[PDB]
Every structure is written in C-alpha cells, then in structure tokens.
Design a protein around this nucleic acid. Structure first.
Ligand SMILES: Nc1ncnc2c1ncn2[C@@H]1O[C@H](COP(=O)(O)OP(=O)(O)OC[C@H]2O[C@@H]3OP(=O)(O)O[C@@H]3[C@@H]2O)[C@@H](O)[C@H]1O
Length: 179
DNA sequence: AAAAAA
C-alpha cells in the first residue's frame, strides 16, 4: 500500500506535469516509453521494476494510467497539452464536482475553469467528487452539473476514467445546485 | 497538490 502510492504519485508527477525534468518527451498523445518511465522512476526509487509499474497500472482504482504496448500515459490530469482520444460521454444527465466552499463565490461568477490543468475534471460519482474536493480543504461543497446544458453550448464531455470525465469548461448557468 | 520528499 505505502510503497505503491509513493511510486504512483511520482508517476502522476512525471506523466501529467514535468516529464522534461527527467529527460522524457511525451508524444502528442501524451505517451512516453515504458522503459523510459522505469528508468526515470529508478533515479528516485532504485528498486522499481517494469513488473511493479505494470502492477500499479492494472490495480489503479480510478483508471489513472494507460499502457499501449511498450508506451504509457496518464489518461487525464495533465498540465501540458495532449491530444486525447477518449470516447464521448453522451449518456450522463448529471455530473458532479467537489470543491472547497471558499471557491464558491468565484465559481458562481466564472464557472469552473481548468486552472493549471488542460481540462476541467468532473465525476459521474458523488462520493468520488466529494473525496476529490477534500484533497484541497476540509470544508467541501458538492456541485451538481446539468450535462445536457454543457452539450448544448458545445462543451462535449469525454470518458477519461472509470468515473472521471473531462470538459473544456463549465459555465455558471450549467451548475444547477451547490450542496 | 495523484504534483516525490527535503
Ligand atoms: N473559477 C474558479 N475559481 C476558483 N477556483 C476554481 C474555479 N474553477 C475551478 N476551481 C477550483 O480550482 C481547483 C483546481 O484544482 P485541480 O486539482 O486542478 O482540480 P480537481 O480538484 O478537479 O482535481 C482534478 C483531478 O485531480 C485528482 O487526482 P486523481 O486522484 O488522479 O484524480 C483527481 C481529479 O480527477 C479545484 O478545487 C476547482 O474546484
């Protein structure tokens, strides 16, 4: 549990935020070579192996990582531009976003913005949305989003994880409730 | 900061 989480957090740093600090160059789809990631991870944790990383990918409860052959990427969460190929979510009526209550006045004025990432992240699941908001602060509000309001304004929603969804932005008129 | 830990 403890060693996997540390290696998994470093993987997220490398694959979403700072591949260049380790000498890696993602392609336009966000993939790096698997052996490159293992060698990068080894300069911090020298006991990491290809099989140990493959384990983390297959057991990740959110679907954070994707392996295609000898290539690996994070599926969402990037702060550098990636051309993702996820399928569109056309079925969800409501989506959810958890956030510290202190952010609500700004969000009611501007809607949800991607901030430092490329996309706004939301969830199909209320618990997962609230647990994500709790990363940033103790007092959290659950935002309910009308997904069809989003599609009507042209902001298509993509299936990035099991429950994770990404969208360009969420205008304030599409936030129906804050709980 | 699933954005390492010091
Ligand atoms: N207009 C506005 N004004 C002020 N504030 C705003 C805002 N519009 C939005 N905000 C808030 O700014 C924060 C950005 O934080 P940021 O970490 O970029 O986003 P999120 O909290 O959505 O997390 C994403 C992934 O991170 C985890 O890692 P994971 O476990 O792999 O997956 C999960 C998950 O999918 C956030 O509080 C948001 O409300």
């Amino acid at each position: 549990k403890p060693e996997r989480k540390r290696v998994s957090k470093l993987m997220a740093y490398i694959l979403r935020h700072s591949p260049e600090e380790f000498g890696l160059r993602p392609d336009v789809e966000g993939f790096v070579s698997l052996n490159e990631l293992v060698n990068a991870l080894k300069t911090v944790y020298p006991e990491v192996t290809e099989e140990f990383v493959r384990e983390i990918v297959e057991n990740d409860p959110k679907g954070r990582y994707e392996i295609r052959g000898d290539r690996i990427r994070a599926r969402y969460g990037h702060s550098f531009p990636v051309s993702l190929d996820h399928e569109e979510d056309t079925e969800s009526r409501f989506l959810y976003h958890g956030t510290p209550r202190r952010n609500l006045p700004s969000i009611l004025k501007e809607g949800l913005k991607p901030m430092k990432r490329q996309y706004v992240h939301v969830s199909t699941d209320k618990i997962e949305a609230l647990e994500t908001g709790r990363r940033h602060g103790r007092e959290v509000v659950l935002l309910v989003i009308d997904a069809e309001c989003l599609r009507k304004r042209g902001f298509k929603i993509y299936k990035a994880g099991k429950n994770v969804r990404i969208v360009e932005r969420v205008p304030p008129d599409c936030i129906t409730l804050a709980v």
